[PDB]
Each structure stands twice: as C-alpha cells, then as structure tokens.
Amino acid sequence: RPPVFWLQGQGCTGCSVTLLNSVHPSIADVLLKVISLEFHPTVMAWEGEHAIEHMRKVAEKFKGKFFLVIEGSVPVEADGKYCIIGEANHHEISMVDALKEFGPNAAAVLAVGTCAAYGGIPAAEGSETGATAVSKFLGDNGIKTPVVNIPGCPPHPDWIVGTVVLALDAIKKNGLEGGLAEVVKVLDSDGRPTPFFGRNIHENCPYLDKYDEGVMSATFTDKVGCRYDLGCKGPMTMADCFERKWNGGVNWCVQNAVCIGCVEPDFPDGKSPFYQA
C-alpha cells in the first residue's frame, strides 16, 4: 500500500464524500488494503502540528514514492492567504506553500475534482482569489511531477478509485517510471483517464431517439422526452454516467433532471445557464 497524502485547498470536501460512497471496493477496503492514507484532515486520527509533522516524516522517508491527492483549487492572490491549511513551527502553511513543498517529491499528483483539475467554481466569473488548477500551478513553478486529472463536481467514486487501481496495477507490472508512462498513455488531452471519460454522454444517452425525433420534455417531471431544451449539456460532456450511473446505480443526472457538464474544463461558466440550451 503506497503512502497517500490528501491535501485540501479551495474545496467543498465533495471529493472525499463521493469516495466514501465507493461500492466495489468499499471505502474500508480501499483504506485497509489498497492505499495507506497517511494524511487526510477530514478522517485521520491526529491533528494540528503533529499531523503535519507526521506527513513530513513519511514524505521524507518516502521521497519520490508517495502519491499526493489535491482537492480544491490553489489561490495565488494575496500571497496564498486565501487558503491556510495548517500551522507548524508557528509558521502558517498556505496551499501555495504546501504544494511547493510536497509537489516536487511526490511520485504523482492526482488532481481530484474539477476545481483542482481545471479551476472550477472558485475560478469562475466573480471570483477574486486567483484560484488556479493544480497542473497549471505546478507548471508555473517549474515542478515536473506528472498530474492525472480525475474531474467531476464531484467525480464518481469509481473514477477516483478506478484511476488509483489502474495506476497501481500499472506500477506493479512495469515498475514506477514505466507504470506511470503506461498511465499517461491512457489520458486524454485534458488529463483524464479514458476508461471513465472516453465516451460522450449524449452519443450514449437512452433518450437519443427522442432527441433525434425532436421530442423534448417541457417540464422536468416529464421523463419521456429528451432533456435538451431544459438545458441538458450531455451533447458536450465526456463521462460514463449513462452506464454506471450514481450512488449504487439508483439514478443519474439526465434521468432525474439535466446533465450540467461537471466533468468538463469550462465548468461552470461554459456550461451555464444550466437550465436553458
């Protein structure tokens, strides 16, 4: 079980909650059998300066071999004062600082959620914190650590867990450098694992017949027609929600209402207004 540090910047913790909803494997199995989640402020036992010190002791022991999950975007305005994630040595730690410290020494960075991957809502029109995507922030600072984007607001648990297993199985078969190269090969131009983001929702939507017939729902509660006029962004969205659906398979956005394109890099503004085409 490789060591994993989970750092939260400008996040809503939705990435962590969706992971707790993992079915196969259960979250208990992921934690106890797949990864060693050494730092995670929402669920870990210790606290404060000691939790940070523990992470540093593990980071220094496993330099170059630990995996760094980043939730939320990184605010660069005001010298990082818009996201303080901890304090050690009477020294406040910003997300900018923390990412410069640990980013270089990770085997890989998993930017989970649209905020970390692409900037998302904290980076949208009207914001003023300098919210920055992880891959951009690292490049801007000369950090060459590979980044895998697992977007979505939130991602499906299978997308996060699935990508970790994908990379761990690659690394077992081909070693660290070779395994990560095999991973990059299966990323699309937006950094996303094609197993989960390789198919367009609309092209696979069960209401595609109604769409072509031009039969549109006019009220949300009308489950016969296509949802396009209500605002469905399925036609511009790459995810497998039509197949694996959500929360143990009980529903998904297009059946219930509309797709809002939460996995795409221009979320939210490029997918807004949500409730008109």
């Binding site: 939705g14 909803n21 050494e38 929402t42 870990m44 404060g48 004062k81």
Partner: protein, 481 residues
C-alpha cells in the same frame, strides 16, 4: 502561568480551521477560531441566471449540499412567485431528510468517534496523541470500531436514498425553483423505504445507545463546554403549504428565556474578519462581501453573526432545546440506568448538561431518532405518481429568502434579482453561527466561548480542545463560503 496552544488543522471536521487557546491553571481561559480558506460564493454568483444558484451554492459544501439546495430553491420560490406542488414539498423533504441521517451518522462515527475509540493499527487511525484519554474497555472499544465500519455502509445507503429522487449525491440535481424534478414512483418509494429500514435499525439499535454508553464513560464532558447557553432555530421541513407548520419550529433561547425568531435582528460583524471595514454591521438583505485578507486585527474569513447583539449557537442541540421534543425511548432508559437522571423531554437534561461538549453529541443522536419519524410520515404522506414541479419564468426584479435548518444548524439564503440576473446573494450558514470570531464589540463567537473552561490537564496531550470543537460538527466551507 498562561500557555497558548495552536491547532491547525483541526482534523475530523470539514474544512480549514485553526484553533488557538490560552491555557491557565489547567483550563482554557481565552480562544480564537480562524477559518483559513475563502472562495467568495456571494460575489461569484452575481450576474448569473438565478436558477443557476441552486446548483452553484451546493458547491459551498459537499457534506451538506442538500441544505444549500433547499435554502436556495426556497429563496428562488419566493422571488419567482412559484407555488410548489404539495407532492413536491414532500419529495424535497424526503431528499433532504435522508441527508440528515447521513450527515449525523458520518459525524459521530467517522469524525467524532475516534475522540473516544482507538481504531485499527494502520493509517489513518495511527499515529495519534500518546496519551489520548481513550477510556473505553477493550470490549466497548471494539464495538466502537465495529460500528464505525458498519456506519460506513449505513451512511452510503443514506446517500442512495438521497439520490433516488435527488439524482446523485453529493450535489443533487433534483431540487429546482418550483419543486422537485422527478415524481416519486411506487417502485422507487419501495427502494427508498427498504434502505430507510436498515438506517432506522442502525440508528435505534447501535447509534443512539452507543452515544449514551460512551458518554457515561466521559461524564466529566457534560460539565464543560456550556459557552453562552444561547441557541437559534429558524425552522425547517414544511409540513403544509401555508408556510407556517414545520418539523422544527423557529425560536431563540438566550439568558434562560424563550423568544421568537425575527430575522431583521440578524447582523454580520467583520471587525475581526478579513473583510473591508466599511461592510460591518449588516443585515443579510443589505449584506456585502469584500475580502480584506491583509486587514490588521482580523483573524478569520468567517463573519461574526449576532442575533439582536447576542452570540448564539445552532445545530441539533439548538433545535432540540428550542423545540423541547419528547426524548427517545432508549434515551430515557439509559439516562436513568447510566446517569441516574429522570427525563421525558429534551430539556429535562437541564441547561448545564444539554449545553455541554457531550450534550451536543447526545442532542445529535436524539435528533437523528426524531428524524426517523418525520421520514416515515412523509413516506406515508407522499402520493406516488403525482406531479412535483411547476416551471416558473425568471422575474426581472425580485427578492426572496429561504430559511431552513442544515444538519449543523440554521441556514438562510437571500437573493436579490435585478434585470433577471443575481444582483446580491447572501448566505448565513450553520457553522457561521458556531465558529465565528469576535464581533465589533469584542464578544466571542459561540465555540470560542464554549471553549472557555475546557480542561487541558496535559499541555502535551491537549485532546479536549478539539473534542469540544468536534461536538459542534463544524464545516468551515459552510462557515466562510
């Protein structure tokens, strides 16, 4: 003889919180809480189609998104003039109430229980404080761990209930201005009730008992954490279409006195918050959010809300105290057996014990039980197949306010629409009421004050600082937004 302790991050909460206390003669004598992360939803929302708000604002928090969804659609309902169908009112209650169960179960087991239970000998359950003050027997402790692990599946099932009519979770698609987007079918109501049975059983047989049990091993924790002993409830879960009967009814409790809830008496101070000096003292209808991250003297991105100048707390304790319902059966039983206390209604714990570190865990477990009956009712009240939504037009100019109770306390959204776009949007959230800094008058926030008097007999293992905080179930993403 004064020692200052700083804890950043406070873990097993949601979001970014620094706690700084001064310890004197083995007790906290001063406290400051800093919400360290800001996003600025109230400015981000400006200029948008108002209907977008009921998706955007959920991203305030991924633990309680259905609460922000609810407050937003209620505010939009008033602004748009939308008459929500009766069946949609019930569907909303089913969507939202199911996350009350998830959030309360999540909090006690996966955030709070490690305060009292030693987990397996692997990360993230180790390492921890050498002297963690973990008092439980080997037998009860393993029961703790067994229930923690079971709670993982139970809370996942709660989100399955949410998603059945809500579309997915976190971040529901199923609540919009005008009602609910998916009519409950008989088939999916069975799927909802099937899961509800499993959660009910876990709540009645495991969660409520273990809170009383574990508390009995920590009776000193009922004698600290009283703070201001002042509470707020704004009402939640409409029981009719008149807007006057609710599962939790509004009310304020302060200085031993019950008083009605008047929202014009809410103001948000910013002297010790990182916002422009000129924006202080505002009611939410005139609220302003101008970040000032370098402003001297400030130490938090959380505004300081005050009710008529009062610093109040919110949450299950606040609601159960204000509403003073009947206690659960097993609560009466175990208060008798394990604490030598005779009680029928929630206030029979008395003010000192209810307003305590461990009392707030008790209030949360009791409320979880209380909610079981509400949901059962709505599963009977709902009419499979009946329409749940109206499709209202966007108003050119309007305002609305949505009031509800999030799992962690009172929540309101206010929206002002101008030119068919959002002109102002102001959020007064639950952990805002609990985890705020001093107001312009130097009065501390609710948890800042409740920390006063907490025991720290071992400055190197100061476990009671964060234990007290966790009893309030904080969510700093909600508090700052």
């Amino acid at each position: 003889g004064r020692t200052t302790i700083a804890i950043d991050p406070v873990t097993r909460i949601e979001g970014h919180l620094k706690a700084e206390v001064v310890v004197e003669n083995g007790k906290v004598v001063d406290a400051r809480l800093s919400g360290g992360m800001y996003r600025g939803f109230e400015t981000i929302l400006r200029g948008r189609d108002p209907r977008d708000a009921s998706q955007i604002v959920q991203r305030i928090c991924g633990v309680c998104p259905t609460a922000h969804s609810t407050a937003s659609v209620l505010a939009l309902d008033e602004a748009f003039g939308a008459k929500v169908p009766n069946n949609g009112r019930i569907t909303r209650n089913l969507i939202f109430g199911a996350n009350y169960l998830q959030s309360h179960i999540l909090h006690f087991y996966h955030l709070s229980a490690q305060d009292f239970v030693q987990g397996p000998d692997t990360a993230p359950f180790v390492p921890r404080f050498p002297k963690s003050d973990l008092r439980l027997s080997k037998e009860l402790n393993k029961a703790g761990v067994d229930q923690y692990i079971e709670a993982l599946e139970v809370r996942r099932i709660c989100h399955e209930m949410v998603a059945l009519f809500g579309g997915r979770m976190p971040h529901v698609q199923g609540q919009v201005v005008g009602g609910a987007t998916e009519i409950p079918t008989k088939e999916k109501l069975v799927e909802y009730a099937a899961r509800f049975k499993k959660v009910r059983d876990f709540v009645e047989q495991k969660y409520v008992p273990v809170v009383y049990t574990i508390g009995s091993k920590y009776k000193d924790m009922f004698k600290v954490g009283q703070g201001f002993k002042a509470a707020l409830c704004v009402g939640a879960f409409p029981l009719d279409n008149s807007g006057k009967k609710h599962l939790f009814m509004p009310g304020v409790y302060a200085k031993g006195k019950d008083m009605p809830f008047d929202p014009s008496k809410i103001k948000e101070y910013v002297k010790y918050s990182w916002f422009a000096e000129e924006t202080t003292g505002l009611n939410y209808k005139e609220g302003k959010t101008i970040p000032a991250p370098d402003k001297a003297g400030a130490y938090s991105f959380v505004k300081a809300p005050r009710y008529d100048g009062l610093s109040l707390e919110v949450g299950p304790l606040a609601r159960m105290w204000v509403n003073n319902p009947e206690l659960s059966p097993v609560g009466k039983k175990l208060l008798k057996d394990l604490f030598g206390i005779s009680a029928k209604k929630f206030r029979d714990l008395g003010e000192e014990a209810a307003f305590s570190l461990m009392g707030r865990h008790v209030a949360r477990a009791e409320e979880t039980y209380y909610m079981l009956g509400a949901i059962e009712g709505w599963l009977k009240e709902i009419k499979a197949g009946e329409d749940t939504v109206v499709m209202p037009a966007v108003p050119a100019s309007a305002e609305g306010t949505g009031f509800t109770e999030a799992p962690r306390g009172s929540l309101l959204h206010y929206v002002k629409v101008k030119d068919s776009k959002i002109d102002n949007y102001q959020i007064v959230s639950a952990s805002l009421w609990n985890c705020n800094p001093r107001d312009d008058m130097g009065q501390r926030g609710a948890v800042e004050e409740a920390l006063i008097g907490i025991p720290v007999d071992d400055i190197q293992n100061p476990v009671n600082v964060a234990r007290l905080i966790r009893a309030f179930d904080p969510x700093l993403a909600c508090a700052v937004h």
